[PDB]
Amino acid sequence: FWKKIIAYQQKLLNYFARNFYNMRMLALFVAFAINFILLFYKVSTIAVHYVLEESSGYMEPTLRILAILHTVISFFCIIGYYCLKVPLVIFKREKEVARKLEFDGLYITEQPSEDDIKGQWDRLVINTQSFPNNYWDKFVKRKVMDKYGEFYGRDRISELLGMDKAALDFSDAREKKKPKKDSSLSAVLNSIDVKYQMWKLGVVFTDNSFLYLAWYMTMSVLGHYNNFFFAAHLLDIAMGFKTLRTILSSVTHNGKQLVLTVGLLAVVVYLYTVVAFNFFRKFYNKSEDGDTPDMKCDDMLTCYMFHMYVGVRAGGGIGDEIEDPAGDEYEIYRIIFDITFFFFVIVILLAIIQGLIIDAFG
Amino acid sequence: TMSVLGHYNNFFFAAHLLDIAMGFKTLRTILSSVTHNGKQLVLTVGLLAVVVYLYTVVAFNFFRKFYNKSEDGDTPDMKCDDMLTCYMFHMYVGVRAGGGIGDEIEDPAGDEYEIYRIIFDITFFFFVIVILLAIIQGLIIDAFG
Amino acid sequence: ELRDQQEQVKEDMETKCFICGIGNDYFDTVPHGFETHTLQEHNLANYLFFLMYLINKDETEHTGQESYVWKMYQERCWEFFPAGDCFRKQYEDQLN
Amino acid sequence: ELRDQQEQVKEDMETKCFICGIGNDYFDTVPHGFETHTLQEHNLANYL
Amino acid sequence: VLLTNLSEHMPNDTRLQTFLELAESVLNYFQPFLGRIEIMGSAKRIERVYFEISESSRTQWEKPQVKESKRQFIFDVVNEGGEKEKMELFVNFCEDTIFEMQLAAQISESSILTVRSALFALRYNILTLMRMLSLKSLKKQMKKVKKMTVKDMVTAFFSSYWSIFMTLLHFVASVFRGFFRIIC
Ligand SMILES: Nc1ncnc2c1ncn2[C@@H]1O[C@H](COP(=O)(O)OP(=O)(O)OP(=O)(O)O)[C@@H](O)[C@H]1O
Ligand SMILES: Nc1ncnc2c1ncn2[C@@H]1O[C@H](COP(=O)(O)OP(=O)(O)OP(=O)(O)O)[C@@H](O)[C@H]1O
Ligand SMILES: [Zn+2]
Ligand SMILES: [Zn+2]
């Protein structure tokens, strides 16, 4: 019983771990299939209902089968992750916890910053009785005790590390025998390490890739309530194909620079909005019939919205959109305004964006 | 075969102008500037199609009353009622438009989804028109270098 | 150009010592020789601290070396700074 | 390419002597050896 | 300084080494305060000079703005600074940095909520998961397990992993609720 259920479970573990990646862009293949079927999707008629057009006539059941298959394959990918990739993550976390417990005494000599999520959360795994479960070094608790035994106190060190003070000497001495068998389910439940499993689950939940795969699950599940949620799974190509990773790294390599450039563009356009709101307000009428005008710069929030929506997008600049200044007292002032807008915003800043991307490539 | 078919139709001789790529090695450098990163360019065009398809999903769900294209209001030509038509519209007119899809679609002033549509249009302009085309230029320049 | 200038500065610092100007390989003939030399033997921070030490310390209390460096500094004659030589090169055979 | 050519010329002049073609390090084995050699011993202006 | 001078002037002397094992403690104390430079002495010879580096000077030098100034100076003296005037520019930089260090020393005279919320969410959500295991009801669940079934084993495995994912979603929801509460 206990001899065979665990064996079959391990068989399933091994199968999923072996097939993880294949089940990963199998998921992408199904995602491209569902999204290709979705291109044949029409609105037809209060509530409006969407009808999937089908020349073949059976595309709707095929789409439902594909949706069920996708929400199953995503779950199998979650399982494959939790079988294959999480033991390595735990092995890492355990080796760093051990090597900061020993060489830095991160919980003896000093204390975590209380701003480190993992630094605070790892405090539980110190006192677990199944520590380096993944890490090879099974002697870390004794090494730390030898290093810090005399100064910080053997009792304090042993209570922190969970070492049985009064019981280790007795174990060296005469040992009492207790009948224990794996066939006892209660004994198995006593044997399992609750706190270590809690810490492991915390680490898994804090893992980034597990969170991405959980998002992949939730999107696939919600795709049943609304079929268009399967379009979000097309975002997985960035990680599925490393060929696209170079192109995307061309952008993300200078991502902070791009964000700061967009902020600077917003500041410059806001300065231009201040200038326009003060001196050039009679030129921002947008109405067609002159009876009632739609003044886009009477309120400065509206003026700023106008400048960053229509002005920046316009090829020539804000002047291609705003009225003509011919025969006005501020003609030259407005010409300087428009030309500076074109040269600074349209020409230079966008050139900064292109330059950042090209420099990232190089 | 092209030269022979040129007798049945004289315009087939225009295809022989494609031979300059191999005839002149001077043009070979310019053409290698493109073909050196050809896989990268193809993948970038595919990624652009995926991004525009995502925008098509968003528009087909929430912004459908803004895609009328008719001149006389009696009969409207709705370009996003069918999502294949909406995707065709987004990759034909939207991508080619300088400002983006917003330069073509209706104006959102005085509507409940004004700010949502402004975010939609601005993100379209910045991601598709600005960045992806900048990726194309960057690939060509990097190939030269 | 800005990025290439950054790279130029970085690789200059990683290849040569700022004061002596000797390549990293000669020091690296002994393990960790380059960083040992640039952090103990020829540290620019150490030279700055030595200048501070001479400036604050009284002139009369100067030792022989301190007086030598003080005179050459006051006359702005930068030859106490080792160029092309180090303790290791001077005692190559003798030290090791 | 123009900027790289400028850098090429500059670093060529700073690393090798124009006439002899010897690297700067050999001269720099004596302090200020490179500029001493290129301004007194092997000056192209002096050859002209 | 005496011991360090002797140690560096004799790479290999066992007796002086033994005195070093007698005197790490003093040496380790005085390591931050002992400076070492090489100069070309009056004998046409490179000599090492040992001096005092004060704690205040060390701290002022390790102030971040002084390091930004150092980086800028290195950038300048490498990119546009020439070989001939390099160590004149270096002395000018040293003088100015010494002045600003002295002025700074003279004038200087005499998140957690989010982390707490995340730990609380993790603790509570994983304790809820542990409650089901601590129920001792697996013996009752053995009703359909005693009747051995591959389908039963597969269903149990899948249900366990699905319960794990359920717990992860509950954790995310609790994190968001605590976030909205903690800003408010
Ligand atoms: N004379 C020298 N003094 C200091 N470093 C030198 C010297 N010659 C070469 N170097 C090298 O230059 C590197 C850069 O030194 P520096 O500490 O100034 O750099 P940093 O990364 O900007 O600063 P830090 O890490 O101290 O904040 C050193 O690690 C060393 O390998
Ligand atoms: N044979 C050589 N003659 C002159 N300089 C040489 C020679 N070989 C190498 N060099 C190096 O080339 C550097 C450039 O010399 P040059 O005086 O022509 O440069 P410059 O900065 O354009 O001129 P200048 O400062 O005299 O107006 C010299 O400082 C020297 O270090
Ligand atoms: Zn040096
Ligand atoms: Zn020469």
Swiss-Prot record, chain E:
Localization per Swiss-Prot or TrEMBL: Sarcoplasmic reticulum membrane
Effect of residue 59 to P: In CPVT1; changed ryanodine-sensitive calcium-release channel activity; increased sensitivity to cytosolic calcium activation
Post-translational modification: Channel activity is modulated by phosphorylation. Phosphorylation is increased in failing heart, leading to calcium leaks and increased cytoplasmic Ca(2+) levels.
Up-regulation conditions: By TGFB1.
Tissue: Detected in heart muscle (at protein level). Heart muscle, brain (cerebellum and hippocampus) and placenta.
Effect of residue 9 to N: Changed ryanodine-sensitive calcium-release channel activity characterized by increased sensitivity to cytosolic calcium activation
Transmembrane residue ranges: 156-176
Domain notes: The calcium release channel activity resides in the C-terminal region while the remaining part of the protein resides in the cytoplasm.
Disease entry from the Swiss-Prot or TrEMBL record: Ventricular tachycardia, catecholaminergic polymorphic, 1, with or without atrial dysfunction and/or dilated cardiomyopathy: An arrhythmogenic disorder characterized by stress-induced, bidirectional ventricular tachycardia that may degenerate into cardiac arrest and cause sudden death. Patients present with recurrent syncope, seizures, or sudden death after physical activity or emotional stress. CPVT1 inheritance is autosomal dominant.
Family: Belongs to the ryanodine receptor (TC 1.A.3.1) family. RYR2 subfamily.
Subunit structure of this chain's protein: Homotetramer. Can also form heterotetramers with RYR1 and RYR3. Interacts with FKBP1A and FKBP1B; these interactions may stabilize the channel in its closed state and prevent Ca(2+) leaks. Interacts with CALM and S100A1; these interactions regulate channel activity. Identified in a complex composed of RYR2, FKBP1B, PKA catalytic subunit, PRKAR2A, AKAP6, and the protein phosphatases PP2A and PP1. Interacts directly with FKBP1B, PKA, PP1 and PP2A. Interacts with SELENON. In cardiac muscles, identified in a complex, composed of FSD2, CMYA5 and RYR2.
Free-text function comment from the UniProt entry: Cytosolic calcium-activated calcium channel that mediates the release of Ca(2+) from the sarcoplasmic reticulum into the cytosol and thereby plays a key role in triggering cardiac muscle contraction. Aberrant channel activation can lead to cardiac arrhythmia. In cardiac myocytes, calcium release is triggered by increased Ca(2+) cytosolic levels due to activation of the L-type calcium channel CACNA1C. The calcium channel activity is modulated by formation of heterotetramers with RYR3. Required for cellular calcium ion homeostasis. Required for embryonic heart development.
Record-given protein name: Ryanodine receptor 2
Segment of the intact protein contained: 4100 to 4310 of 4967
